[PDB]
Amino acid sequence: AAAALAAALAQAL
Ligand SMILES: *c1ccc([N+](=O)[O-])c2nonc12
């Protein structure tokens, strides 16, 4: 889950 989210945020920004 950590990675999923990490990646989400990365993309968002
Ligand atoms: C999660 C998984 C892979 C990568 N990546 O840089 O290839 C990520 N970057 O930020 N979160 C992830």
Side-chain angles (χ1 to χ4, degrees):
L5 279 178
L9 183 65
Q11 186 175 290
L13 302 177

